[PDB]
Amino acid sequence: QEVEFDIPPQALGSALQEFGRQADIQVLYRPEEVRNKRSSAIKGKLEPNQAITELLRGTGASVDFQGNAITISVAEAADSSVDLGATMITSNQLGTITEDSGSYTPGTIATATRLVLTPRETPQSITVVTRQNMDDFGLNNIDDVMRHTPGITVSAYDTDRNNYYARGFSINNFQYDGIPSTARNVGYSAGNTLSDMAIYDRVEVLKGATGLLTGAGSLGATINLIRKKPTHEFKGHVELGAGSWDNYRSELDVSGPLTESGNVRGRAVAAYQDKHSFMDHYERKTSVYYGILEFDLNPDTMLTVGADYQDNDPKGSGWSGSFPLFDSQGNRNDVSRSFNNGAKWSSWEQYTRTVFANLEHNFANGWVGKVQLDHKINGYHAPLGAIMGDWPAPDNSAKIVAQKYTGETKSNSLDIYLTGPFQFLGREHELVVGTSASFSHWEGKSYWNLRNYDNTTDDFINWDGDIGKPDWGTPSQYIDDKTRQLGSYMTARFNVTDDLNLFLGGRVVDYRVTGLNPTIRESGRFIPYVGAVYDLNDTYSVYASYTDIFMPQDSWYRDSSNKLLEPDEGQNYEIGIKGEYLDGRLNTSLAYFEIHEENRAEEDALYNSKPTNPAITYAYKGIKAKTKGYEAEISGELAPGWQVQAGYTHKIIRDDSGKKVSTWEPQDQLSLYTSYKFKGALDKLTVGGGARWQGKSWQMVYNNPRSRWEKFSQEDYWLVDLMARYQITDKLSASVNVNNVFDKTYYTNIGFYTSASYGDPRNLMFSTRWDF
Numbered sequence: 171q172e173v174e175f176d177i178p179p180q181a182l183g184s185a186l187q188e189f190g191r192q193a194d195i196q197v198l199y200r201p202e203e204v205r206n207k208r209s210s211a212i213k214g215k216l217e218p219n220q221a222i223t224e225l226l227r228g229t230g231a232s233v234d235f236q237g238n239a240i241t242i243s244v245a246e247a248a249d250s251s252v253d254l255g256a257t258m259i260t261s262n263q264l265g266t267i268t269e270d271s272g273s274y275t276p277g278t279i280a281t282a283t284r285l286v287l288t289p290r291e292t293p294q295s296i297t298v299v300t301r302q303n304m305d306d307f308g309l310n311n312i313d314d315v316m317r318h319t320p321g322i323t324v325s326a327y328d329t330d331r332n333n334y335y336a337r338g339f340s341i342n343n344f345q346y347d348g349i350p351s352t353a354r355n356v357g358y359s360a361g362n363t364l365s366d367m368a369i370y371d372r373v374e375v376l377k378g379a380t381g382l383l384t385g386a387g388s389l390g391a392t393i394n395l396i397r398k399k400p401t402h403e404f405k406g407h408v409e410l411g412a413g414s415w416d417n418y419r420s421e422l423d424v425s426g427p428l429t430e431s432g433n434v435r436g437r438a439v440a441a442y443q444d445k446h447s448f449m450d451h452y453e454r455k456t457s458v459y460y461g462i463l464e465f466d467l468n469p470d471t472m473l474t475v476g477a478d479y480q481d482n483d484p485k486g487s488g489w490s491g492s493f494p495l496f497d498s499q500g501n502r503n504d505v506s507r508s509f510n511n512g513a514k515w516s517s518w519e520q521y522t523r524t525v526f527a528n529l530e531h532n533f534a535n536g537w538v539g540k541v542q543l544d545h546k547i548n549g550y551h552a553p554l555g556a557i558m559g560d561w562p563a564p565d566n567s568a569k570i571v572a573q574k575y576t577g578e579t580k581s582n583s584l585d586i587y588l589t590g591p592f593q594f595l596g597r598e599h600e601l602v603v604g605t606s607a608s609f610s611h612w613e614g615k616s617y618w619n620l621r622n623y624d625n626t627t628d629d630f631i632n633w634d635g636d637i638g639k640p641d642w643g644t645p646s647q648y649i650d651d652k653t654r655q656l657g658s659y660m661t662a663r664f665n666v667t668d669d670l671n672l673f674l675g676g677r678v679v680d681y682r683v684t685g686l687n688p689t690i691r692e693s694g695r696f697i698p699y700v701g702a703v704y705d706l707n708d709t710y711s712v713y714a715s716y717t718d719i720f721m722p723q724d725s726w727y728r729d730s731s732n733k734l735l736e737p738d739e740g741q742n743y744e745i746g747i748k749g750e751y752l753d754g755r756l757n758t759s760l761a762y763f764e765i766h767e768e769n770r771a772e773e774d775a776l777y778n779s780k781p782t783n784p785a786i787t788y789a790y791k792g793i794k795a796k797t798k799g800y801e802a803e804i805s806g807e808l809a810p811g812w813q814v815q816a817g818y819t820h821k822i823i824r825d826d827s828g829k830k831v832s833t834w835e836p837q838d839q840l841s842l843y844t845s846y847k848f849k850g851a852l853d854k855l856t857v858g859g860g861a862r863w864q865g866k867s868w869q870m871v872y873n874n875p876r877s878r879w880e881k882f883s884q885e886d887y888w889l890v891d892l893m894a895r896y897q898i899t900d901k902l903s904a905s906v907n908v909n910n911v912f913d914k915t916y917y918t919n920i921g922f923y924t925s926a927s928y929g930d931p932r933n934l935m936f937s938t939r940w941d942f
């Protein structure tokens with residue numbers, strides 16, 4: 171629909187950038203193609219496609235309309251075979267916006283190397299959950315998005331913290347708009363498991379080893395969340411929704427120009443959600459606000475400032491799991507899915523907030539520079555009280571552990587990078603060079619010395635959480651941890667022939683962790699990056715990448731000698747084939763990957779049998795582990811109204827003991843989610859369903875009262891979802907979502923501190939959405 175343009179004649183390069191902006195559309199173009207060329211003037215209210223061909227008049231170019239992207243090209247009479255992955259300069263550094271694409275496959279993405287590339291162009295397993303996928307399945311937080319993310323297994327620590335695995339590993343790398351956060355432990359990390367989706371265009375998950383832009387992190391994967399941007403045309407919606415267990419949500423999103431010319435633009439969102447739950451006596455109020463303003467200092471320099479806020483506020487939180495596996499006499503416990511061991515007042519409230527500014531400049535070069543500044547806060551207030559231990563006892567009584575942890579972590583980040591193309595041996599390549607700095611400071615108080623508390627409860631079977639609240643007494647501890655990370659990085663993308671692209675780069679990294687433990691330091695550590703993409707035909711490419719990452723170890727990870735283990739480190743070896751159909755409306759990938767870990771913390775049984783250095787008392791051992799597996803995935807259009815996302819992932823991870831590790835992550839998993847838009851009489855109806863399956867998973871847990879190790883098994887199971895929306899009116903729709911249709915009763919945690927957690931029983935969600 172109709173847009174307000176003002177782009178005067180200039181370098182086609184600039185004109186294309188100016189365009190991408192005025193139109194909220196990503197423009198991809200070949201730098202060597204547009205180099206000596208100028209646009210014709212465009213002026214006024216126009217439709218973005220009239221507009222573009224008017225602009226290109228006289229330049230000899232053609233436009234390929236691709237949703238939220240347009241790619242420009244300038245055909246010759248000549249053309250000796252086509253260069254499908256030719257170097258392309260882009261107008262949005264974060265990639266193609268997914269909102270309004272109507273699609274479940276992404277557009278372009280910068281998750282891997284900071285270069286704007288397509289999933290076919292990127293030599294790494296890259297899976298995205300698009301904006302509309304999130305709308306259709308009602309994924310309102312990152313837990314739901316992970317649950318629907320191909321290749322990811324979401325398991326429960328407690329009611330207020332989930333765990334995400336990829337490829338054998340716990341993910342602990344998160345980014346916001348491609349700025350890594352610090353996630354060292356749950357101190358720094360408050361509220362990552364919980365981020366609301368109201369403020370995001372999309373979540374993008376790079377699986378493998380992602381040190382190139384994470385810097386220091388875990389193996390498995392990064393999870394990168396892209397914030398919603400403002401727009402040149404005005405628009406918004408209000409949403410209301412109502413679900414199982416008095417789960418009520420509302421959301422408001424408003425976007426547009428704030429001045430007559432549109433040189434300042436803004437977007438604002440607020441979402442509030444108060445829900446009870448199938449678990450007895452648990453509730454959770456979440457609140458979120460978001461504000462972003464964009465200012466154009468001039469057609470080629472943009473300033474952005476913005477803040478975000480989310481408070482996650484529960485009652486009846488638990489510490490670890492929903493109930494204890496064994497009872498006092500060591501039999502397995504059997505309890506309703508409603509069983510909730512947290513106490514009534516028990517709460518792990520976690521809050522997050524960010525203030526950020528960026529500046530982005532187009533060098534008349536075709537180069538573009540970007541400075542990113544961040545202030546983030548991750549805070550928690552955790553008066554936890556839960557039944558814990560081998561309970562009930564034969565007389566049905568039980569015992570509560572109760573501790574209190576309050577704390578806050580402030581981070582500041584500076585990130586600056588430069589991106590552009592360059593000729594080498596007659597051909598066009600591109601480059602990112604960037605540098606980064608983060609300082610984050612955790613401070614906190616723990617309380618464990620309870621004064622005059624009677625922690626017994628008389629009735630376990632009817633546990634209600636109805637126990638008193640203790641006297642926390644005085645702080646037992648002050649936390650003071652400072653982490654400081656400095657990185658510099660470079661990736662070059664070489665267009666060697668018309669079918670081969672070579673990726674060469676890496677990151678040098680400096681990591682210091684300071685405070686109440688002995689200083690942890692790593693200086694000048696190099697993280698290599700090698701990738702290659704070979705085109706086979708118009709449709710298929712093969713690729714291979716060697717990628718790396720390390721994390722200095724937590725400080726309690728010392729050895730026999732009382733020395734900290736060398737950093738937890740891994741390389742991902744990946745080879746695969748990616749296919750691209752229907753002009754990038756549909757994407758397929760099949761990958762084989764291996765992950766070699768070195769220095770993986772490991773108990774040290776022989777020592778810990780009987781410590782002998784008085785210096786340490788529980789030492790670890792730095793071992794090796796290996797992940798072997800493969801992955802297949804598909805996303806996008808199976809047919810005109812018909813959209814899917816699906817994947818199959820197989821893995822086994824072994825450590826040096828030879829034994830299987832991460833045995834709770836299933837060895838085999840599968841996801842398919844789909845919806846269909848009817849045409850003709852019923853073109854206002856959208857239907858959808860999906861399923862998720864995983865094979866066997868187990869834990870080894872020690873039965874203390876009987877003194878034996880037992881295996882606990884979750885037999886393979888399916889989860890089915892269904893979904894329908896009807897667009898009653900131009901401005902108004904009603905959807906229903908039904909989740910876990912066959913009410914499969916299954917487990918999301920067995921073994922975490924000898925406890926267990928059930929996954930959600932059948933739940934419904936109803937909602938209307940109104941678009942102004």
Ligand SMILES: CCCCCCCCOCCOCCOCCOCCOCCO
Nearest residue numbers: 404424425426436437438461462463476477
């Ligand atoms: C130092 C702290 C930084 C705070 C940044 C917060 C920014 C909050 O700004 C909110 C901007 O939202 C703009 C909403 O856009 C709506 C546009 O409609 C304007 C009225 O329309 C008139 C006719 O269409």
Ligand SMILES: CCCCCCCCOCCOCCOCCOCCOCCO
Nearest residue numbers: 903904905906908913932933934936937938
């Ligand atoms: C163990 C409990 C699970 C119960 C399972 C029930 C499954 C049945 O699904 C039926 C849903 O159909 C109800 C249709 O209601 C229509 C939704 O309309 C939305 C209202 O929009 C309001 C406009 O302002």
